[PDB]
Structure formats: C-alpha cells, structure tokens
Amino acid sequence: GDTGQAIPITPHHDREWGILSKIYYYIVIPAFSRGSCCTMGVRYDRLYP
Amino acid sequence: RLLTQCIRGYWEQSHRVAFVNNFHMLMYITTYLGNGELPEVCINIYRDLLQHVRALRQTITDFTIQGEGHNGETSEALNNILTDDTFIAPILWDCDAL
Amino acid sequence: TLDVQMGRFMETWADMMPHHPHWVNEHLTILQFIAPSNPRLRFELNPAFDFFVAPGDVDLPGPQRPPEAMPTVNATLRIINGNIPVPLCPISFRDCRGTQLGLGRHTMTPATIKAVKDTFEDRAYPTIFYMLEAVIHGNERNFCALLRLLTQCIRGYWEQSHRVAFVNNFHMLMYITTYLGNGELPEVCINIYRDLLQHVRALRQTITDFTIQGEGHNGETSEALNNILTDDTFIAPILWDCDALIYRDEAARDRLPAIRVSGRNGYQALHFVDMAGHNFQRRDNVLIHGRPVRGDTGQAIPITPHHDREWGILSKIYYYIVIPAFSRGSCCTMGVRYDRLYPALQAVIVPEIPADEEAPTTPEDPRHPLHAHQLVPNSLNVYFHNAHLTVDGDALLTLQELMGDMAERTTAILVSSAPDAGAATATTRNMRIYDGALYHGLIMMAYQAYDETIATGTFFYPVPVNPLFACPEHLASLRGMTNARRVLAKMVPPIPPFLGANHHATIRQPVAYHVTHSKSDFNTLTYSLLGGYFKFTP
Amino acid sequence: ALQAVIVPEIPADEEAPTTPEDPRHPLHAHQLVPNSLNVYFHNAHLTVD
Amino acid sequence: SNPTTFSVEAIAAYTPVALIRLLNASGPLQPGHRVDIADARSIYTVGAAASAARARANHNANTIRRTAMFAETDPMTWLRPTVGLRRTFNPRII
Amino acid sequence: SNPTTFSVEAIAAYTPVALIRLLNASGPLQPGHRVDIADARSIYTVGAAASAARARANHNANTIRRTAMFAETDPMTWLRPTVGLRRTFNPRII
C-alpha cells in the first residue's frame, strides 16, 4: 500500500507473529542468556550522525 | 547485500550466530536469506531456532481444549499467556501489537 | 471455477456451525469416553458402523443450501479399522502393531529420513518448483523435454542446502528414478529417491504378504477385498491423468458408481489442448489427459491409460502413507491459477549468443541469462534468481516447446460407490461412500506467510480434501480471510461439502489424529499407518 | 543394432580425444546420431573412447 | 505490423506482437483505458508465445536437431530397433 | 555556496554543505565559539545526508536502476503477475 496521511494504521503481520514473538522473547532468550541480557533504549540523536 | 556480508564475515571467523537477540531479524533471515545466500550451516541454525519456537507453540496449543471461548476471547488466550493478546512483548518494533 | 465455490463455502461456514462438532473430539482418553457424561457414547454400538444424526428425506448429494427437515439417525460403514475412535483403539497399540509389521522388512536409512524431513519442514521452499510441477502436470513427454533444466535445478537446490526437491507429488520420483538415475544427478540424491521408492514397494509387498490370494469375488481381486490401498475404486487425493478414473470405472462395474466433475455427471477426457484452443475459463466437464507418446492423439481415437495398474497402487500408497508420515498434517492440497501462471512463464530473457562463440556458464559474465544486466523485473529470470539457482539459456528455452502441451484448469472430482462385494448385504447398498479428489492439483509441504516477494494467493488457493491434508494455516492464501474464520478452522478441519463429508468418506478423522498426534519414529509410523489401512469387511 | 558405431576418423600425428567435450569424441553431441550404439552408451552416461 | 500500428494497451490491440524482451508492459500503461476488456488476456498470451517462438529464429545454427525422444516408429523398424536420445547433453555445436 | 561562506564551526552556519569525505569536523574546532547553540545538530545531519546523496552523483553509470523490490501494483496486474527483486546481486555492469 501507500503511506499517505489520512489512511488509518493497519497491522504489518498477522496475529501469529505476536504469539511467536512473545514465545521467543519469554522462553528462548532467557533460557540461553540466563538472566544476563538486559533491555535498553537507544540514543538516536547520537547514533544517526 | 550488507547484512549477508556481515553475517558471513561474523560466521566464518568465529563460528557464532549474529542478529539473534532481535525477533524481527531471524524471521527476515529465514524468509529472505534462506535460499542459499548464507552458508548451509547458518540457515540451518536459524531454521532450527524457528522450528523450536513453533514446536513450543504447538505444545501450548496441544494441552488446551478448543471450542470454549468466552466474551470474544480464544481458549488458548484464556488458558495461556503467550497466546494472550492483552499481554505484550517487552520490545516493540511496530505498533501492531497495541 | 473452484474459487467462487470455495468463497461461498467460507462465507456460509462462518455461521453454519453454532457449536463444537461431535466427531472432532477424538482427544478423549478411554476413561473420559466411557463416562456417562459423553453424549457420543449412546451412538457407539456396533464396531463396524458409525452412527450420527442426519437430515431427513434428502437424496445425497443434495443442493448447496441444506434443506430444512427433521433430524434422523443414519448409519454408515466403518470401512477401515483405523476409523475406530482413538479412545477405543489407541495410538500406542497402533504403533506397537506397526512395529510388529515392520519386523524384518525394508527400512529407510537415516540420511534420506533427515533430508526428506528437512525438505518437508522447509518454509523457504522455492515456488519455481511448484510452478514447474504445475506446468509439467505429470506427463512423461514434458519431463523428458525438460531433462536438462530439471537436472540443473535439482543439482542447484541440492548442493546449496542439502535438501531434496520435487518430492511432494508422486509423478516426479518415478521420472527421476527411471530417467535421471544413471549418473546425471549426484550419488546421494538418486540414492535418496531410490530409497523412498524401495520403501514404497516394501509397503506394497507387505500388503501382498498379509493377504491370501486366489479368492476373488465378482471381479474384485483378493488384495482389493482385504486392503484399501490396493482397491481400484478408491482414488488418489490428486490426479494428473485420467487413467485412475478408467481403472475405477472398469474395476467396480457392479457397485453403482457416480462421478460428478463440476456439474453434470461423467467426464469427457479430451487430450492435447494447445495454444490455439486453450480456453482457460472452461465451464465444461472436459478433462485433459495429456499426450500418450507411442501412438497418435487424433479426435476419434479412444483414450488409453498411460501406465500400468501398479502405478495407481503405488501412488495411493505414497500419498496416503509417506506424505502424512513426513509432513504430519501440515501439507495441504490446492489447485492452481493457470490464467496467471501461464502469462508469467512467457517472459524469458535468454540473450543472443553470436556464432563461433562459447555459451557462458558462470553467472559472473554479462552474457549469462542470470547476470544482473538482464535481470529485468517481472520475468522468469527474477523467479530463478530469487531461488538462487543457476540455469543456462537452453534450459530456459525448453519451456517454449513445453508450451505445446498444456493444462487448462483444476477441478474438483467427487466419486461415489456402494461398499464392496464382501460387505454388501441388502441394507448396506443404500449406504454410499463419498470421497473427493483434485484434478491437476498441487500439494505444498509447508506454508510461508511472511515471504512478500510474491503476493499471497497469486497462483494457488487452498481447497483441501482430506482430514489428513487439513491445512489450518494455509487458508490465509485464500482471498478475504478473517481471524474468526482462522480460529474457526483451527479446531475443525475445513472440508467443503462438495468434496465429501467426514462421516461419509473413507479416510476419516481418527487416522488423521493418529498421524498428527503420534511421536514414535518414521519407519514405524509408516508401518503403523499401513496396519491402519485394512478393511473391516468380514 | 550393434552394427552402427559412429566413431569419427582422427587425423595422423594427433592425440586421441579423451574428454567428451571436444567435437572429435564419439559421445560428443555432434557424433550422437539417432539409432546407433552411441545413444545406447550415452543413455547410461558412460564414457568410452 | 503496419498498419495496425503498435501496442499502446489499448484493448484492440493486434495479434502479432513480434517483439523481443519487451520492457513495454512495465513500462507504462498508465493505467489501461476505459474499454470493456475480456481478451486482451488470451490473445496477449497467444501473441507472446508466438512472438517468443518466432524470437528464437536463430539458435537453430546451434542445434543439434530434435530427435524421436522415446522409442517409437519410425516407420522402417524391420531391420534395426529404435532408441530415442535422452536430452541431457549440451546443444551447442560450436 | 557563496556568499555564506565556508564552514568554520560557527553555529549559524549554512544548510548546504555539499562536500564529501571531509577531514574538517576533526579537523580543528578548536573548540567552538560562544554561541547559545541548540541546532546546529539537526541542520548538520540533514545537510550531511544531502551531501552524501548528492555526492553519489556518479556510481549511477553502474546502476542497474532500482526496482519495486516487492509484489505490488504496477498498474496493470491483469495480464501478468508482479514479482519484485531481492537485492542480492552485484550491480556493476562493467
């Protein structure tokens, strides 16, 4: 489709993508990292230049 | 091209798998760069991780009983959380989950 | 055109069922099935019959809209003994019986098991293989016209991912084993194909082993009176040529047959449709048989089957044992959209190689067909480059002389017959078995939803006819699919009523439940499925 | 059927061809005429001099 | 070819269509005009197949002619058997 | 370009900035002068992106024009399907 301005927002992927993302992030990541990984934000004003 | 070169260079120098933290990276690697651009070992690793994720999903849907939904909520969402649409992922890249 | 029918079924089915069906709850254990709270308990009386509720005063097959009538109890014959419900005949017993059957028989080496299991669980399987399998449509003339292209394609797919191609449909591994088996392919691939074929013939020999010959009643051989995979009345889930219909029509001959091919009864079977008279939007019941080679096509020449009667038995064994034992309820049968597939195959950008010059082989020179300079959008070179396969100019030029023989469109065939002469008493002749088939249909191993290089539903649309080939995830390829329909079809296998119903078919829900909820092995699963397919006729 | 052999003549003071890629080979496509022994050998993908 | 004249798409259109490797469908269209259109599709498919088959024209100095493919008559068949070529070689001729 | 005149950093400064591979940010600064400064930065990054896209200029003799990359209209879609390219080839033409 097109970007536009008045077009309402549609989902990119189906409902199964959210389920698989939740399964991955809540099972496979903490089984491998074992509490060592950490979620962080980003500094886009110091990354893009 | 850049991601293929980056993944190949990281693979055949330390035998490790790149771009594995982000969930919207291994789906895109499996769907697009899975036809033979990457070496035969890496795409097997990504396909194996995705197959284990889908096996966990099938295990979730196996131990529930379908056909029992209340107030427009599915039975899997009424039984489990990883199939519940109210619960969201810790990292959001798109607004479709909301 | 099988699109409007599927759309009408999906629109009517969103509110046709107001509750859970009583024949899909096969996950009950024996203690819960036996308990008096089960409403299905009072309808299980005779081990050779299924009892249900049915509309009254209706002559099957009826109209599209089901007429309003009072419900009456009807019965049908449990033809297979694998159709006994899973709480009454468990999965562990079936797997132990399959272990008993496969005591000293042929087994598959783990190399071909791993390779076939990898290519059945592959979600990035290239669609150019599906287009090639649809456009060849199981003709020997087209396959030997495309020998160089198919050899290069199978080699390129093999020594880049170590997987086996063209394994979904049965009229490819015969043609690979017979023709590309003398050394054109590498040593491992032909060994894999030969091992699959050896396992199929071992299953057929096991069928012959457990029956007693010399007892034929009313033109039915003893194996067809014992087994189902050797019964010529029962047909394959997909058809490529009209030989199986001829063998079925000449084989039964007393059990009253009735075949419905898109409207009025009976088929016409006109072969050799070419560019001049294709007529993609044909509403008739004309089926394309293909060109027999040793002879003439003509117009007044009567039709003959291409292959022997053993080919039908081996195809039934393959599609009904080996495919569900590997895919495990993930593959789905669909038709094709030929009016979009055939214009997409007419764009080839094979360049003009001058005389007294060598044909380029590597794709790093500008003269190669898959060089980027001739990689124009919306062609076939983009299709082959997306799959990352290397082909030459002549291998792409062979499709032009493939194009002389073509298929018009897919169609849904519903055949029906009385039960066989072993179990045909005065009251079972009214009971009839209704099973469906897809003429010129395809089967994909696994479905990808997030591959956006090709728009969804461009070439294939899901029309599933089996409980074995139920596809709860392939239905997103159909145009106009909502989440309510997806969660409705997740729990109930969506079969259209113009292709047979579950209680009136031969292959029923419990054998599908056995093939989708067993985790034992791959050899013992095949032998357990073969021990499933034995008749309960006295 | 055994009477037809399509081996070509090799000029004197020249090496005999070994690979089937040169046109002077009997199993080269140029010397592969229908209904001869060469197509019997080529169907089996066997190389002979 | 003339006077027809050339394909603007336009749903008239003409039957040959004897072009090579056409970047004309895409291309502009842009889009198609306001005609009833039914075929269009079939005549374009036949014309494109005929255009490609005529667009071979050459490469027949590289053939290596076609053969009987399988074993069939071949109406002599009383003093030698018939065997077809399995098309697995490289038709190049040099 | 003129008269603005050149980037000495200076926080005024100018939006194009049409250079490439500049050894000017470091470079001297040295350090910046006495200006309140808030942006600066945003104008610098849009000027740098413009100064890179313009500094392509050439390398389009080896393009290989861009494609749709996906399967979308393409305003015909009634006489052939549409398929995009996966950008994994090496575009140089030579």
Curated annotation (Swiss-Prot), chain B:
Similarity field: Belongs to the herpesviridae major capsid protein family.
Protein name: Major capsid protein
Annotated localization: Virion; Host nucleus
Subunit structure as annotated in this protein's UniProt entry: Homomultimer. Makes the hexons and eleven out of twelve pentons. Interacts with triplex proteins 1/TRX1 and 2/TRX2; adjacent capsomers are linked together in groups of three by triplexes, heterotrimeric complexes composed of one molecule of TRX1 and two molecules of TRX2. Interacts with scaffold protein; this interaction allows efficient MCP transport to the host nucleus. Interacts with capsid vertex component 2/CVC2. Interacts with the small capsomere-interacting protein/SCP.
Coiled-coil ranges (or none): none
Protein function: Self-assembles to form an icosahedral capsid with a T=16 symmetry, about 200 nm in diameter, and consisting of 150 hexons and 12 pentons (total of 162 capsomers). Hexons form the edges and faces of the capsid and are each composed of six MCP molecules. In contrast, one penton is found at each of the 12 vertices. Eleven of the pentons are MCP pentamers, while the last vertex is occupied by the portal complex.
Source taxon at top rank: Viruses
Signal peptide: none
Curated annotation (Swiss-Prot), chain C:
Compartment(s) where it occurs, according to its Swiss-Prot or TrEMBL record: Virion; Host nucleus
Source species, domain of life: Viruses
Subunit structure, as described in the record: Homomultimer. Makes the hexons and eleven out of twelve pentons. Interacts with triplex proteins 1/TRX1 and 2/TRX2; adjacent capsomers are linked together in groups of three by triplexes, heterotrimeric complexes composed of one molecule of TRX1 and two molecules of TRX2. Interacts with scaffold protein; this interaction allows efficient MCP transport to the host nucleus. Interacts with capsid vertex component 2/CVC2. Interacts with the small capsomere-interacting protein/SCP.
Entry's family note: Belongs to the herpesviridae major capsid protein family.
Record function comment: Self-assembles to form an icosahedral capsid with a T=16 symmetry, about 200 nm in diameter, and consisting of 150 hexons and 12 pentons (total of 162 capsomers). Hexons form the edges and faces of the capsid and are each composed of six MCP molecules. In contrast, one penton is found at each of the 12 vertices. Eleven of the pentons are MCP pentamers, while the last vertex is occupied by the portal complex.
Protein name: Major capsid protein
